[PDB]
Design an enzyme around this catalytic site. Structure first.
Site, short mmCIF file in Angstrom:
data_model
loop_
_atom_site.label_atom_id
_atom_site.label_comp_id
_atom_site.label_asym_id
_atom_site.label_seq_id
_atom_site.Cartn_x
_atom_site.Cartn_y
_atom_site.Cartn_z
N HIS A 80 0.83 -1.21 0.00
CA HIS A 80 0.00 0.00 0.00
C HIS A 80 0.86 1.25 0.00
O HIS A 80 1.81 1.35 0.76
CB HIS A 80 -1.01 0.05 1.16
CG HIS A 80 -2.20 -0.88 1.03
ND1 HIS A 80 -2.90 -1.00 -0.16
CD2 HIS A 80 -2.79 -1.67 1.96
CE1 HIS A 80 -3.85 -1.89 0.07
NE2 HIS A 80 -3.82 -2.33 1.33
N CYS A 129 -0.02 2.11 -5.01
CA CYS A 129 -0.99 3.15 -5.39
C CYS A 129 -0.40 4.52 -5.12
O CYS A 129 0.48 4.65 -4.27
CB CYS A 129 -2.29 2.96 -4.62
SG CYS A 129 -3.41 1.75 -5.37
#
Lengths: 386, 4, 386, 4
Positions: A80, A129
């Site tokens: 992440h 991301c």
């Protein structure tokens, strides 16, 4: 004419099992595959999965210790990520919901530290991301970078975009790795190669218009990940660095255990990641006086938090390992010890023997303690000092 | 195909 | 197979004469040279110098008007720049000391607007400094960009660094342009070419370790600045676009002026930048009754703020023009009209004739008004509307 | 050689 590497060191982190966030799957597979590719390019690789903020910080410190003037330093992160005010952030497994920059590692901070070590190359492959963490109030106000023309970024997606993984029930793969893996070994300049990867990534149907590779580079020298390593180490400083590497990828010796009952238990060890080790118990010899017997591993250091569902399984795949039955010696009891970065202590477990004697109902239990020291990354003492 |  | 351009449009801004900040010199020269190179690559070029914030905003609006689906859009800026919280800012001449983001143009805002027009390519060549404007309190909180894999950045320096110009008393040149000019015409992919420019820029002795070229790209297609333009325009939308371009590079017709005293004054016009025009007055014919006479230009629109020291000069170089005496017809009186983006009105000046008659002391003054409409970029009506 |  020919650009040279003093050494080629890589640090690869793959976070999946987030505590407060959606768990991922491809990071394990991608990390395993990058390591193998990077090793073929003669890299000193450190492979790590599911690290907490504290843990993450220590992996960078160990990586930094392996970088000196002229060393090609590479960082790969799959997990992440968020991007706020021009800074990229990798999110550790321990991250709260909501999270802030404090809870995360800022790539820019790692870059500065590398530049302080006079590295020849600084490659960053961020397979994460890149959106706004609207909850992040803090803006780090970081110091300016020194102009060193050797910084290369391989962003899996663009700012404000998402990096995708295909979670096909079986293996699961990351999109950046699907296009990177087929082209990494090429003798092209790092920037040129990354741009040729970008082209093939556009040909992707699953991600078109959602994810695109972003290259950012200052590199002014025909440097590549294929560039050769300054032949004979022969320097005292070069020798200290090879010891420090070897210190982390030490695996216990496949021991044989003799039991008071005249039973032999072969104990094997396999390496999956610097963080991950697999133990296997084979019953090699038993006396005629005993026909029933099962060998089982228990009493692991509580720091490791070993789930019973990942231990004493008929095959390695049942423990969650990426390693398959063709890679690991057949017919034993396989047990997966992930999270070695959590071992402060020395590795001590009991190899428990449950057996039965000819013509008697009663079940006999012979426990034997086994100390295997600090296997792999545990040997680095990341928890050392005050 | 899910995000990271 | 072959990537195609619907059109190739460029907007080039060069700020030098800052009101509250150090004046620059190379921007004029660099802009002049990029235009010529970009025209050889068949680009619809708009060349502009010393624009204020308001002025700058209108040049982007005119540029945006010339971009449609498939059009290659390029932006070149040479002047003062700053980078705060991941945004690049171009500083206009009117900028106060201290300045903020409000006072400046954010490149990211221009990029979004281009993406809204479905452009095939988005090249940005920012030949400016990239440090923190510690006085900037405001953080724009801009909306996320659409993933379009056609964005290319050619940063002259890296974040927190400076872009340099060599101010050698004569011409003066910019460092990014010195290495870019020799390689721009190559049929390489824009990213690849920019990276080959980066290598040659490292070979620079004047800037080593102070300035390095930074490439940021999402481009996933073998697109280049040499790519050909979709042959026959034949579309109604394609015709509107060529008119809109031609509308800005219209120069007054070299008129002859007849005077009541039987004297002829040839009036010539030269183009230097879309913003810059040069007038020249030659005395073509005079009657025998007059031997002494000088033609001089006055009464220019006050919007233009024409300094007397830049008007009625024996050579073009004395007016500040980049154009030299070999480019401009010999022996006239040359006058430089920069700042046409400041003309709201129609261009009216008087061509004043000071003369003398055979055998008399008295000096005769015959003023004749000349209306040349809206030359070049004035014709775009950037001040139009409410 | 001066900055921009």
């Amino acid at each position: 004419g020919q650009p040279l590497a003093k050494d080629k060191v890589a640090l690869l982190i793959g976070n999946m099992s987030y505590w407060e966030h959606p768990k991922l799957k491809a990071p394990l597979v991608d990390v395993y595959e990058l390591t193998n590719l990077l090793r073929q390019l003669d890299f000193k690789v450190v492979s790590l999965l599911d690290l907490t903020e504290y843990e993450m910080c220590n992996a960078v410190d160990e990586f930094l210790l392996l970088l000196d003037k002229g060393v090609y330093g590479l960082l790969y992160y799959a997990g992440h990520g968020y991007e706020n005010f021009g800074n990229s952030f990798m999110v550790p497994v321990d991250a709260p919901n909501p999270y802030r920059s404090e809870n995360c590692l800022c790539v820019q901070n790692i870059l500065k530290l590398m530049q302080e070590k006079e590295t020849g190359l600084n490659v960053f492959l961020l397979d994460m991301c890149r959106k706004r963490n609207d909850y992040d109030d803090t803006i780090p106000i970081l110091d300016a970078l020194k102009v060193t023309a050797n910084i290369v970024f391989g962003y899996a997606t663009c700012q404000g975009a998402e990096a995708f993984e295909i979670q096909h029930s079986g293996l699961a793969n990351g999109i950046f790795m699907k296009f990177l893996k087929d082209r990494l070994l090429e003798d092209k300049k790092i920037t040129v190669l990354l741009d040729e990867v970008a082209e093939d990534m556009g040909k992707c149907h699953l991600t078109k218009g959602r994810q695109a590779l972003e290259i950012r580079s200052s590199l002014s020298e025909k440097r590549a990940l294929t560039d050769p390593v300054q032949g004979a180490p022969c320097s005292a400083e070069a020798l200290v660095r090879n010891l420090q590497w070897a210190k982390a990828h030490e695996l216990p010796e496949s021991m044989c255990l003799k039991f008071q009952c005249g039973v032999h238990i072969q104990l094997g060890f396999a390496a999956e990641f610097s963080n991950v080790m697999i133990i296997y118990t084979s019953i090699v010899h038993k006396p005629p006086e005993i026909i029933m017997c099962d060998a089982y591993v228990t009493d692991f250091p509580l720091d490791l938090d070993i789930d019973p569902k990942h231990a004493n399984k008929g095959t390695p795949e049942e423990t969650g390992s990426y390693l398959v039955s063709k890679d690991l010696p057949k017919h034993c009891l396989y047990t997966r010890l992930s999270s070695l970065q959590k071992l402060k202590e020395h590795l001590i477990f009991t190899v428990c023997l449950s057996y039965q004697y000819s013509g008697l109902e009663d079940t006999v239990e012979e426990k034997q303690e086994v100390n295997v020291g600090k296997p792999l990354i545990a040997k680095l003492d990341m928890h050392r000092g005050l | 195909v899910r995000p990271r």
